[PDB]
Write a protein that binds this ligand. Structure first.
Ligand code: ATP
Ligand code: AES
Lengths: 436, 431
């Protein structure tokens, strides 16, 4: 009767496939079999230590301002968390999600996100990148800048790093402490050499903490997870998936729904007072042949933010290419009363102009700048202005959606007013710098 | 430094030799010889007694249809050299047939996960995003065989270009096009892995040039399939340890060549295959995002591993111009609603697979079990289809309506009552 995978505290040595009884968070008992384990954690697959208890998160608002390991133990030299509640972490705990669509605005402070691919409360918007690109730097800037403008609910951040180096850990820790962002954040840091099982538990501890804060304390919580790919690397070598090939015989069935137990955990929480939003980092692995991992495409259902090496090589930060980027729920979180009435129009116009300008880079290479029309030259130049002024921003520059929109209107000014076909006259008259 | 311009080798040249290139308008741009094959010179442009070269030309003629050529345009089918009625500069700087018009009508691919949920539109650029070991080429071949433009007064044609392929893949491609009759309306450009690197980079330009000629001078809707861009980028890797900086601008000279042509009686649509390398150390992963501006079709390992063909995951897939090409008079009035409803239902079902693995199968509500099962039906009956199964948009929509009857009518939040009463199987009238 193979079923859900749970995590239980290890109190004694246990053997692979050992039958055990588990005392769950809700007080009920489960029958299961052991799959793998670390010094403090064992992975069990439920059916229907000999008699153990589930690994739990010491749920408490005191988690905020703390930096913990993947298993919830202090890394900041502080005392262990004094729990207000001990919650199971596999996702069965509170059943906090409402059947409501994601909808309001979350200000990341990054123009290429807030302006053209708006992140909304309850959404899961992955950052798609690759080795060598600054995705962690982007994840860190969002963590310290993110807020929920005009909201009556408090805002919190759950930052979860997986399989990182000592240097990286140092990097992250010092930043949260120096900026003060730590006061409104719970940080879970899993090192590359920490037990694999601990990496697997890391995203679950994070999400459980997120759900608790969102549901128990009516907060809008932003969960940043980096990097799924590293999570997937530990997963493929854990338990019964060990030395097994995906799609073949012997590959554990749970191996293909595992990522789903993570991306299913996002959304507005019951009561509609809080919510859990996810920003997972999906870094393209360069070893699909040697290290086959679970398909990560399942995490992409509401869009994605694309990090491009092209912009990175041009010396632009953050190197986000808005063209292949998308936020399917964007229309929920923008407009009058959320951002500003002209948000959709400006974003639409910048996208159109930037896409045109980029195509023109090809034409100019085909016929020469001397042969390009005046009109086309304007768009060609607009693409440069967009990348140089809108896309590019400092690592410590936190732009309000108003700043983002103004920069947008400023560069749009470079195009002929008669070429702004994506902006209704009403807005052109009201916000265009020439009629303002 | 780029950009790259191809010139016919009319006289001996040397590396770094400064030369003048005769543009199709009588003017001349100057560059430097970067590399060259025996008949083609690759020049990098800037901005008497020196070489003045002619741009490499494509022997254009409707007689191109039904022919299998090499990346350089030479017969590979044993047939005679193409008798041109026009010599077209393959760099694209001689005609520019594109209209200032947005892509708009329907292109029926016959594949449900494309036509139904992320529709291909005439003049659009819709890449197939895949990876090593996946069947993107089989999907590409199927589209080439089945694609059409229902109700269009303009004829339809296919331009299929393969870069750096093996001899076995070539034979396999030539065989399919020939036995199905698909070759009858196609111009096939085949470049083999051993062919000079120079011929590999001219291949897509020869293809796009043939496409523009048919579309603009013969008022045809042309579908251009390029598989793949990664091999193309590999050829650029070393022409004169990642890819050269000019690659990004170079790729732009390819993706700018798409759209409705002047007169709006024709168009060029591109379906480039972008497969990610299975190994980065040797085959670094290039940034081909410049080609992705109108969406993409995602081939997913998950579906392939489950034994489903075509393994297309609609959730991450997207067609930004879909609304242009659907609805009454194009496909059917209920298209957008069925598409929205299936997408939402599939996404919900997939999330529930997550919940099932958290609380267990028997813990799911009856309602949730309904969606969980719909996800299975979607993959088993909508996604899955034969490699030779050409579905009309009607078949696709009807298959959609059938699996949707698994969901509670009160759950079809994406379909307004008017379409429910008219098309829902439980309400539709016999007629
Ligand atoms: N699981 C997935 N795997 C691959 N591609 C996906 C997946 N899900 C969605 N996509 C699509 O692929 C695109 C991401 O690939 P993209 O071209 O951005 O790579 P990249 O980040 O530019 O690589 P590079 O490291 O060279 O910059 C997105 O536009 C998205 O639409
Ligand atoms: N790698 C070979 C480059 C090359 C090859 C041939 C020439 S010659 O074409 O002018 F006949 C010039 C340069």
């Amino acid at each position: 009767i193979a079923g859900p995978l749970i995590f239980v505290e290890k109190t004694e040595p246990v053997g692979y496939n050992e039958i055990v009884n588990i005392k769950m968070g809700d007080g009920t008992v489960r029958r299961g079999q052991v799959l793998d384990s670390s010094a403090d954690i064992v992975v069990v697959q439920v059916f229907e230590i000999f008699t153990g208890e589930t690994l739990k998160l010491p749920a408490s608002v005191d988690l905020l301002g703390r930096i913990l390991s993947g298993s919830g133990e202090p890394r900041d030299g502080g005392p262990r968390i004094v729990p207000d509640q001990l919650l199971d972490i596999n996702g069965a705990a509170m059943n906090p999600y409402a059947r409501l669509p994601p909808k309001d605005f979350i200000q990341t402070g990054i123009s290429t996100i807030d302006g053209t691919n708006t992140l909304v409360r309850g959404q899961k918007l992955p950052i798609f990148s690759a080795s060598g690109l600054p995705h962690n730097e982007i994840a860190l800037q969002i963590a310290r800048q993110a807020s929920v403008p005009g909201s009556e609910s408090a805002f919190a951040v759950v930052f979860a790093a997986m399989g990182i180096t000592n240097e990286e850990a140092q990097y992250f820790m010092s930043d949260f402490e120096k900026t003060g962002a730590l006061e409104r954040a719970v940080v879970f840091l899993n090192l590359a050499d920490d037990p694999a099982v601990e990496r697997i538990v890391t995203p679950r501890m994070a999400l459980t903490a997120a759900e608790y804060l969102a549901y128990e304390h009516g907060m809008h919580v932003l969960v940043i997870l980096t990097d799924i790919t590293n999570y997937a690397e530990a997963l493929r070598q854990m338990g019964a998936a060990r030395n097994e090939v995906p799609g073949r015989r012997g590959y554990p069935g749970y191996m293909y729904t595992d990522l789903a137990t993570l991306y299913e955990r996002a959304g507005i929480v019951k009561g509609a007072k809080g919510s859990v939003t996810q920003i997972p980092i999906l870094s393209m692995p360069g070893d699909d042949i040697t290290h086959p991992i679970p398909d990560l495409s399942g995490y992409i259902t509401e869009g994605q933010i694309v990090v491009a090496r092209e912009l990175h090589r041009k010396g632009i930060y953050p190197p986000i290419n808005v063209l292949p980027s998308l936020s399917r729920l964007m229309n929920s979180g923008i407009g009058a009363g959320k951002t500003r009435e002209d948000h959709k129009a400006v974003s639409d116009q910048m996208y159109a102009g930037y896409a045109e300008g980029r195509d023109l880079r090809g034409l100019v290479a085909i016929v020469g700048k001397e042969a390009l029309s005046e009109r086309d030259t304007k768009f060609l130049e607009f693409a440069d202005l967009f990348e140089d002024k809108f896309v590019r921003q400092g690592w410590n520059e936190n732009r309000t959606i108003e700043d983002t929109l103004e920069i947008g209107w400023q560069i749009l000014t470079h195009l002929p007013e008669n070429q702004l076909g994506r902006i209704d006259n009403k807005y052109i008259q009201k916000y265009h710098p020439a009629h303002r």
